[model samples]
Target: MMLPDWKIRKEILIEPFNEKSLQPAGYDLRVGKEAYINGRLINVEKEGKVVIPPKTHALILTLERVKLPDDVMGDMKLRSSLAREGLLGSFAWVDPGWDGNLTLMLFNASEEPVELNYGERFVQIAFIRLEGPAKNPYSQHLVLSKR
Candidate 1:
């Protein structure tokens, strides 16, 4: 059944669920146990600290992967309220038939280092199912070259 409903495939967990809220149309994505950049690891050993290089603008998540079904796909958009408070977030749409850890692009707009705790819900994903089959089906070339 093709419909507009954001279903949580699995329970996204963090130490304290009370600190986050899942939107009616999107599932909040928590920071996993590990986050990487170009195969290099960061020093986020503490509960609420992320290591960001000075003058560097963003952190890329290549090791983290996600799978999307053919019928549904979406993006993890930053909440407007957070952006209004000087936090910047970047998210790309999840294409149909895409499978693998997603490379999350995290940008630090604040002057100081952002405190990113493990299991902290930073982005929300909204799922949308198509009513009809895709006219142009996806191919291996499309999948490989897609960013």
Candidate 2:
């Protein structure tokens, strides 16, 4: 079953949590300072904007560092507002016991360039409870230390 907002706040570890980000079924996440496009790091905070040309993809880190319990996992998606602007965040699953800032891959699928500001609410993640904790919970992965 999906975790409710109250349980999420009490159980999950979300650094720099915003009370307003708590939704009935999920939590909204904001963009962090840095973004990677074509393997180059762009300082979004310094630039004050992220510009994505048509059909381009950029990897952005979340402002929050999420720590999930052993019996919980998560699924992330682009917010509808951002999706309406033609920015698509590739679907990703957060493994049980995962702890780190999430990296979101955003693709601009529109015919024009899209600009996003730093700290925008670009993604939302829904937490799920597993039947039991995995024997091998997510610990070491290449992407785990990406951010």
Candidate 3:
């Protein structure tokens, strides 16, 4: 089942958490410092915002890092407000026991440039309590791969 706001606050799922963005069943993720556009990385924090050109995509990071435990799962989505503006995001989920900032794709589907501010609420993640902890969780491989 989807975790509620108080439970999210009680968990270590999001770093630099905010009560305002904590919803009844999810947490809104804000735009982070950097983005990849035109095959290059741009510092969005330095630019103050991003302007996605029509029919293109940029990979942006989340302002908060997630440290999910072994028994939890996360389903992520772009906020509806941005979606209505022709901005798009991937249908993605966080694996159990993974702990990192998410690098997400933001696409401009419209014929016009779209400006979204730095620190804007870009996405939300619905945290879920899995039936049980996975015997093999994501962080083990991620760390072993880098080892």
**Candidate maximizing lDDT:** 2
For each candidate, give its TM-score against the true structure.
0.63, 0.90, 0.90
lDDT per residue for candidate 2 within 1-147, as digits (tens), equals 999999999999988898878889888988777788876788887998788879998888787889999999898878888889898888678999889888778899999999888877778899999998899998111142455
Clashes of each: 6, 0, 0
Identify the superior model by lDDT, candidate 2 or candidate 3: 2
Candidate 3 lDDT at 66 equals 88
Clashing pairs in 1: 64-101, 64-102, 65-100, 65-101, 65-102, 66-100
CA displacement after TM-score superposition, residue 103 of candidate 1 (Å): 1.6
* RMSD in order of candidates: 6.2, 3.1, 4.0
Tell me the tens digit of each residue's lDDT in model 1 across 43-126.
443434455443334443332344565666666776565455456666677776666545566666656655566555667667
